[PDB]
Amino acid sequence: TATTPQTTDAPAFPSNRSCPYQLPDGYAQLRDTPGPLHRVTLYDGRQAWVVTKHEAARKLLGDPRLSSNRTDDNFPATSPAFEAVRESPQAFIGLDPPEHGTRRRMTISEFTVKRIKGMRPEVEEVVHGFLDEMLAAGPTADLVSQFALPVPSMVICRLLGVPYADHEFFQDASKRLVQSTDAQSALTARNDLAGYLDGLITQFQTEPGAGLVGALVADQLANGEIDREELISTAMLLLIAGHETTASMTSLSVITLLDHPEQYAALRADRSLVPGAVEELLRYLAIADIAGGRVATADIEVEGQLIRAGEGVIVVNSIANRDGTVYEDPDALDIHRSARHHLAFGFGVHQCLGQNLARLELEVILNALMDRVPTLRLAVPVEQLVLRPGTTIQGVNELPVTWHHH
Numbered sequence: 001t002a003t004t005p006q007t008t009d010a011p012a013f014p015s016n017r018s019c020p021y022q023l024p025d026g027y028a029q030l031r032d033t034p035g036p037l038h039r040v041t042l043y044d045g046r047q048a049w050v051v052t053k054h055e056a057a058r059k060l061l062g063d064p065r066l067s068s069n070r071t072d073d074n075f076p077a078t079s080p081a082f083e084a085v086r087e088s089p090q091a092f093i094g095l096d097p098p099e100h101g102t103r104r105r106m107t108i109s110e111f112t113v114k115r116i117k118g119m120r121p122e123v124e125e126v127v128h129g130f131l132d133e134m135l136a137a138g139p140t141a142d143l144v145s146q147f148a149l150p151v152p153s154m155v156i157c158r159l160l161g162v163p164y165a166d167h168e169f170f171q172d173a174s175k176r177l178v179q180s181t182d183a184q185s186a187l188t189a190r191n192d193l194a195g196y197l198d199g200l201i202t203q204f205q206t207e208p209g210a211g212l213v214g215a216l217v218a219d220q221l222a223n224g225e226i227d228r229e230e231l232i233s234t235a236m237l238l239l240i241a242g243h244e245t246t247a248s249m250t251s252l253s254v255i256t257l258l259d260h261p262e263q264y265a266a267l268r269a270d271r272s273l274v275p276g277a278v279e280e281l282l283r284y285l286a287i288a289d290i291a292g293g294r295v296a297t298a299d300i301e302v303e304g305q306l307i308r309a310g311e312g313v314i315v316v317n318s319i320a321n322r323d324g325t326v327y328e329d330p331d332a333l334d335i336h337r338s339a340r341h342h343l344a345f346g347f348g349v350h351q352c353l354g355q356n357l358a359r360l361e362l363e364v365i366l367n368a369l370m371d372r373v374p375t376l377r378l379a380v381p382v383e384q385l386v387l388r389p390g391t392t393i394q395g396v397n398e399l400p401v402t403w404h405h406h
């Protein structure tokens with residue numbers, strides 16, 4: 001057996017959070033090591049680079065030599081479940097320019113600033129509606145299943161034209177796909193969603209439909225500008241991202257804010273602080289911190305280190321968002337700080353399409369919780385919560401909460 005010291009200079013990656021709003025111990029070590037890159041070992045033994053510093057993360061996310069093609073054999077897989085993505089058709093998150101832009105531009109009209117503004121009444125109505133139901137249904141609740149997940153789910157379904165009557169099916173399928181640990185169950189969940197979306201496309205070809213899927217069917221698909229399979233992949237990407245990211249931000253923001261009651265109280269006293277607090281929570285919680293997988297298609301020199309063609313690179317935006325040369329005392333939550341330039345949404349051509357919808361949802365949600373349930377508190381200690389592993393979007397699958405009755 002192994003009878004020698006076990007220290008490595010390529011630690012296992014990813015690591016799991018033990019506290020919802022702090023770096024895993026291994027990530028703090030990576031943050032502290034000088035230099036933009038560090039070697040890591042992925043689940044299957046293959047070595048990869050992680051980017052651990054803020055400016056280098058921007059530079060490398062902007063470098064066209066780091067491809068987003070998940071079907072490349074050398075793309076960095078962080079769990080066996082990734083092989084489902086490598087073997088499946090790709091939405092534009094997995095495309096490089098110029099193909100990336102031709103698909104992304106088919107969807108941007110739904111996510112413009114003007115459109116996001118017009119969505120405020122629907123978002124406020126959805127948030128307060130689910131709040132009405134939860135506040136009436138019990139002294140305690142699971143904030144995730146009763147509030148954090150249904151709210152962004154209903155909103156993105158309206159944007160897409162996906163009927164919410166099927167929400168039990170596709171919410172469950174979304175969860176299985178994002179949170180699966182093995183390739184078979186990820187593949188089944190993708191096929192479940194794909195078959196559902198394919199039937200919706202045929203329905204819209206018979207009776208033109210609402211929302212973005214309706215528009216893609218009536219226009220780009222009818223002109224042959226997007227393949228049917230690509231339309232499915234695109235709708236699936238938007239559906240899942242629209243569900244899972246905002247829901248995780250909501251639950252983790254509640255946990256984090258209740259552990260910083262002085263800042264939560266200041267926020268309640270001055271709602272002009274809510275947009276800045278949302279930016280700080282995005283920086284601090286960085287829930288998609290592994291969404292920056294890339295593969296080099298050519299050699300890239302980075303500050304004396306060399307990324308060789310064919311190596312995998314993961315831009316770890318949670319670590320980059322704790323760069324003390326950008327955010328003073330980076331491990332402190334400070335809703336009054338400038339969290340500008342954070343990487344929670346990435347950077348460059350793939351920067352999050354939904355970022356301003358997410359910012360709107362989280363502002364409405366925080367204002368609604370402070371308005372309607374100012375007495376909200378966790379029903380279990382933080383040490384009893386179960387955090388998702390570092391191989392998926394960060395969050396908690398259950399969040400027991402209570403408040404003052406009626």
Ligand code: HEM
Binds near residue numbers: 291346351
């Ligand atoms: C709530 C917090 C959210 C976070 C932290 C987040 C995070 C991210 C990140 C880091 C990326 C970059 C991926 C990469 O570089 O490979 C990304 C891309 C993307 N996100 Fe978000 N996201 C959020 C919400 C949303 C929402 C609500 C939607 C709604 C559809 C969405 C849709 C997308 C899409 C379509 C892309 C791919 C963009 C492209 O490849 O051009 N996201 N997201």
